[PDB]
Symmetry: C3
Subunit: 275 residues, 3 copies
């Protein structure tokens, strides 16, 4: 056997079952959507996770292989902290934190032959070593006074069942292997500095990557794919996405309204400033 | 014969033709998009239909089926109502109403064997009884004065042709059966109370669901699908979607601009409280 | 041998390899998103290319072909101009221009037999003639003063390698042929009136279409597709889409914030105007 076997478990005139075994380096990354409310600047609408893409390249055994991994979270816990009700009080309406009840979906795709025409897969199995994602420090740009910082928060990712997924980005639609990761809250806890909250275990979305370029997991997978026998057929990969046109229309109308209102406000201020 | 047979009509080494005949309980739902124009709040930008997902789980004959149904509207008619150009008058720039000339699409997918690898389908036929969708009572909120409530509106969906489609959500991409419904307006008439619009037939987008958790229609479908012979292959079902990155960037840009403007307004209002 | 043959290069019980040769009329267009900042109204946030859909019908030999095209731009240079930092000074933060270093993608799909089950394709080749795309006139509608107009800009799209891709919209998902075009700058040059910028080549995103219905290019392609033997088999074409729910929720929250702020501003003007 070998670390990157390529076995033919069946063949036919037009189709063939190919067994692919591979050792892969899954480098995944977190993306945080931070929405801040309007007013003085002491209110934050939300700090949540969103799916994050990451395309990279690494050296296999004598080969330069280009991979694309997208990370996402499920079963997140929404926490809320209030400094009061006045406009000056620091308050976050909600923010997502990862706990033992959550899952992390890291779907990995590669340019190897194991993914070229992956439309049907059976006997899918994998091995994955656990890792630790430690929470970094994220500071809040308050208009006045001290700056709170959300520091800490570690979760150990442990391997779970692997399945089949699809990465839908604006450029490429890829048929990927979704590795599911369970989480265990670890000793490094997260606390909001200068706030009445601390020593609570999890990994908030404020700064999951903690300044790290990525989180790397060395995995292995073995699958059987039903692909055309001729190794020339190529499934469409590159994409032209024009989804959610109604959302674009709403964004345009909202921007038009905001532009008109801001134009009126700016004129009403400049007339006074022109004394 | 059976209500839920799994017949074989052809088989080869790697592929086969499965004739699936199944009874289904299509539970669908409407989604209303409401955009309210800025200002005193006496006008609404748009009241439109939008695609609506609904994932449920119902008991078939001895088994539990997890179903995912997505509803959409086509050919919607654009009505409008304005009392004048005065800011303090009721104005709906454009709202969507469903009439006979329009159609209702319902994509339906199940975790049963009939949808495991549905990529190719032929001889797709179905039977599907009609349903009645009545209109709810949606109230319009104003700073002061009366509250015109849009009430009434009923339309009967009658079964029409059936095709194949794809349900694209934020979590799952599903090859599904698209049931098409023609429309016949029923006796109830939608009208805005305390307003000069009444005796109008159709189904508006204000509150299509009428407070119902779902609209349920019983269906049956028979189809022949070209599926891999081994009942262990799996087409990707879940998804990791990061499309419309430019739209996210524009949303962030406008959020930043609005935050700046709101902070400016807050500073201006706070300066007026010094003495 | 005729221009629109569909030859059988292989056939089996359930699958076959078909050689489709077709002469097509690709009609495409450029879509541009123009984002305008707030303030007095002398700052455009950006003028950027975005994917552009266009569905049409053209007469083949004795039959009408319904085609769907999607244009996109890759590797577009970003040019910025800032005459002065003052609010009243004209500014365009960044606009996209396509040069030799840029590429134009055009995804093309038809209701013909060549695209009906296009999931696996080999031996793909094409013959496409070049087309000249010239930018039109776009006027910057400033609040008060002169309106600069950006006029000119001409490039030649020369046929490049052809591959597979997929067009995703709010209505259809189409496995399609991706024609790539390289760019060669032409004699006409884009310039902005009443500005110290001119004699620089490219195709600015302000008005690539030159106020024209479409850019038409006659092409031909030959491909070998692995499709089900029975032609009654159909893959999904239409889709129901609910992608980017987080985006819609954030847009709704932003709309609520804007409505609250605008109502507050309008009430402030009303009370300030009440003597």
């Amino acid at each position: 056997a070998q670390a990157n076997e390529d076995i033919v478990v069946s063949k036919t005139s037009l189709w063939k079952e190919m067994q692919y075994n591979r050792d892969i380096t899954i480098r995944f990354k977190f993306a945080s959507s931070i929405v801040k409310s309007g007013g003085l600047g002491y209110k934050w609408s939300e700090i949540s996770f969103k799916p994050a893409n990451y395309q990279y390249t690494y050296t296999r055994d004598g080969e330069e292989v280009t991979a694309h991994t997208t990370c996402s979270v499920n079963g997140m816990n929404d926490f809320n902290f209030n400094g009061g009700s006045l406009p000056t009080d620091f308050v976050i309406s909600r923010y997502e934190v990862i706990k033992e009840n959550s899952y992390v979906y890291v779907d990995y795709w590669d340019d190897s032959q194991a993914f070229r025409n992956m439309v049907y897969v059976r006997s899918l199995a994998a091995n994955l070593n656990s890792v630790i994602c430690t929470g970094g420090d994220y500071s809040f740009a308050l208009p006045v006074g001290q700056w709170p910082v959300m520091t800490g928060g570690a979760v150990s990712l442990h391997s779970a069942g692997v399945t089949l997924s699809t990465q839908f980005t604006d450029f490429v639609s890829l048929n990927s292997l979704r590795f599911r990761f369970r989480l265990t809250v670890e000793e490094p806890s997260f606390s909001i500095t200068r706030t009445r909250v601390s020593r609570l275990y999890g990994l908030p979305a404020a700064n999951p990557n903690n300044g790290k370029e990525y989180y790397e997991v060395a995995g292995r997978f073995s699958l059987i794919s039903l692909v055309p026998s001729n190794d020339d057929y190529q499934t469409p990969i590159t994409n032209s996405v024009t989804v959610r046109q109604d959302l674009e229309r709403q964004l345009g109308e909202l921007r038009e309204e905001f532009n008109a209102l801001s134009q009126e406000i700016a004129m009403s201020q400049l007339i006074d400033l022109a004394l």
